[PDB]
């Protein structure tokens, strides 16, 4: 909704910044095992609820 509280909007800010893909220079490190960001969330498939 347009009528947001500060805590909810701040909560949506953190979840929006975490939705980035993994930078490709991480995959070139020594003991790298991460192929891709497995915690990606889509707005239509997984709802936050909070």
Name which of 6 and 31 has its Cβ closer to RNA. Answer: 6
Q: Which of 29, 35, 39, 42 touches RNA by CB under 7 A?
A: 42
Residue 39 in contact with RNA, rule: CB under 7 A: no
The DSSP annotation for the chain comes to --S--HHHHHHHHHHHHTTPPPPTTTTTSTT----S-TT---TTTS----
The distance of closest approach from Cβ of residue 9 to RNA in the complex, given in angstroms and rounded to an integer, is 5
Q: Which residues bind RNA (CB under 7 A)?
A: 1-6, 8-9, 12, 15-16, 19-21, 40-49
């Amino acid at each position: 909704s347009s009528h947001k509280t500060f805590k909810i909007k701040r909560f949506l800010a953190k979840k929006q910044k975490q939705n980035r893909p993994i930078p490709q220079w991480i995959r070139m490190k020594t003991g790298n095992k991460i192929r891709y960001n497995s915690k990606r969330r889509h707005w239509r498939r997984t709802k936050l609820g909070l």
